[PDB]
Ligand binder design. Structure first.
Ligand SMILES: CCOC(=O)CCNCc1ccccc1
Ligand SMILES: CCOC(=O)CCNCc1ccccc1
Lengths: 300, 237
């Protein structure tokens, strides 16, 4: 079990770690988060009390280095840094643990929620969507735009999700205009899976990352990408059976975790009604359709 | 965006544009079968592709063989329309290609936009105008070439005859839409109006009769009366 210490907490802030959230008061004696489960990516995220503008945070994997948070009064945010001196780091953590100044990742033993939301998410793929090669962790915020959003403006601060556009030369094959538009299997299986992502695990990893950025940061371009990647599968008549069954599990846990009060802004009525009730896969997402109908019957 | 009454003079500027109407592409008669079920029989159709500035009409005849063995024909017809408009644009020299294509039915937008993905500078637009182009098959010479076709064929017409020698495109389009609206509302009476006087004839190379300027005013008034007459017969006014 790993630890992300904090130098201090000089400004009042709501801190979230994955699906958990806690509050820290201004100058409260807080020095970080312990007992973080090894084996998954994690996200540590922030919303300042005095300016809820800009949720921001950091994706990281404690297996890749020793990371800590320190507030920067010039840039006005909590920054993640890497400590290269392992013995300094271990001694800092030990002192803060002995003084009981660290909150504990409150993982219930039965609870697989975080694994289920991050099954296919890998730090190496995050670092290619979020390009800042000198750090081992990745910063994301509410306002960052996607490569596709910018085509329709700082490229270094962008989310490089794979561009999906159903009315494009990438989407449609010369002489297959009706076929490819009404049945996206070519675009899903040849262009995206075989060509770009290489396998369904990488496709699902990007889909899962997009959802988590939409949910944790209110990142609108990430919400667009998540729905586009769902629609591309649902709109394909030919999808490997293992992919459909896995997608149903992925979406079930996403819908289960979504705050009920954010559904209006995080769920696209058109995509979901199309996917569940009109698409080729309208009958292939039993678990997702059941939770959606019981939790969000208004949207439908 | 969409084409409406507010931007109506745009039709007659010097930017090449085409209207595309697909309402006569897939045409059927519905009938009973020996077993008392209902079936359709397709008849030949056409795409109505019109340059409103010049009157040039590209009438692509859709022969019933294109539907043989195909499913979901009403959907296919939109994609076949877009396929054929695409092909027409590709057959034209660059300097004759349209800068905008206006579809009369919004269901043609995605099929056409998909077919012209490799032509990004041609705008595909809907219209809020209710244009009476479905009544094209009430023009006898157009209906005749469609019904006689035994294979796919493109036939070129000027839907304005020689009117542009005497009137502007705006006035010619207004006359055309009035004639077609009348033929759509009461075809028998409209044709009666157009031919009642045996001394006014249709030239071999024309679609409409050879009316003088004064006679066109009389004809246009009679068509407006017909439209108003039918409007009163319909709504009991
Ligand atoms: C009775 C209401 O309870 C809450 O609102 C729980 C808030 N978060 C718990 C937490 C605390 C510390 C780290 C991580 C999570
Ligand atoms: C002479 C027709 O040759 C073509 O290739 C038709 C192109 N149709 C639109 C399109 C173009 C390119 C990719 C996808 C769609």
């Amino acid at each position: 079990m790993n630890t992300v210490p904090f130098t201090s907490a000089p400004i009042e802030v709501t801190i979230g770690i994955d699906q958990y959230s806690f509050n820290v008061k201004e100058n409260q004696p807080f020095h970080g988060i312990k007992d973080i489960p090894i084996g998954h990516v994690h996200v540590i995220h922030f919303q300042h009390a005095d300016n809820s503008s800009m949720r921001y945070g950091y994706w990281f994997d404690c297996r890749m280095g020793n990371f800590y948070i320190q507030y920067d009064p010039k840039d006005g945010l909590y920054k993640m840094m890497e400590e290269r001196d392992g013995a300094k780091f271990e001694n800092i953590v030990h002192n803060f643990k002995e003084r009981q100044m660290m909150v504990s990742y409150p993982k219930i033993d039965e609870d697989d929620t975080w694994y289920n939301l991050t099954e296919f998410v890998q730090m190496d793929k995050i670092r290619k969507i979020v390009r800042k090669d000198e750090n081992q962790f990745s910063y994301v915020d509410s306002s960052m735009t996607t490569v596709q959003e910018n085509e329709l403006s700082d490229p270094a601060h962008s989310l490089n999700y794979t561009v999906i556009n159903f009315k494009s030369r990438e989407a449609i094959r010369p002489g297959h205009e009706m076929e490819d538009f009404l049945d996206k299997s070519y675009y899903l299986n040849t262009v995206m899976l075989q060509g770009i992502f290489k396998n369904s695990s990488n496709y699902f990893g990007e889909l899962q990352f997009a959802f988590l950025n939409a949910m944790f940061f209110g990142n609108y371009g990430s919400s667009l990408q998540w729905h586009a990647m769902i629609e591309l599968i649902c709109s394909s008549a030919t999808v490997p059976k293992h992919m459909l069954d896995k997608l149903d599990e992925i979406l079930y846990y996403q819908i289960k975790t979504l705050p009920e009060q954010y559904s209006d802004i995080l769920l696209n009525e058109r995509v979901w009604n199309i996917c569940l009730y009109s698409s080729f896969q309208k009958n292939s997402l039993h678990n997702t359709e059941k939770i959606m109908e019981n939790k969000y019957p208004e949207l439908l | 965006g969409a084409m409406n009454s507010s931007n109506y003079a745009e039709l007659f500027n010097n930017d090449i544009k085409l209207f595309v109407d697909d309402t006569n592409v897939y045409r059927v008669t519905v009938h009973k079968t020996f077993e008392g079920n209902v079936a359709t029989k397709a008849i030949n159709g056409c795409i109505f592709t019109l340059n409103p500035k010049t009157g040039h009409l590209f009438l692509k005849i859709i022969h019933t063989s294109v539907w043989a063995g195909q499913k979901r024909l009403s959907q296919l017809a939109k994609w076949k329309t877009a396929e054929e408009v695409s092909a027409l644009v590709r057959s034209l020299p660059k300097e004759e290609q349209p800068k905008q294509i206006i579809v009369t039915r919004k269901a043609m937008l995605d099929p056409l936009e998909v077919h012209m993905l490799d032509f990004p500078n041609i705008a595909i637009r809907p219209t809020e105008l209710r244009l009476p182009f479905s009544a094209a098959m009430s023009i006898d010479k157009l209906s005749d070439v469609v019904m006689k076709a035994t294979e796919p064929q493109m036939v070129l017409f000027n839907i304005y005859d020689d009117w542009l020698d005497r009137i502007s495109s705006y006035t010619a389009f207004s006359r055309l839409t009035l004639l077609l609206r009348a033929l759509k509302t009461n075809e028998e009476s409209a044709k009666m109006i157009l031919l009642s006087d045996p001394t006014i004839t249709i030239k071999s190379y024309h679609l409409w009769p050879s009316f003088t300027d004064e006679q066109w005013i009389t004809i246009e008034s009679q068509m407006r009366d017909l439209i108003l007459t039918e409007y009163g017969r319909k709504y009991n006014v």
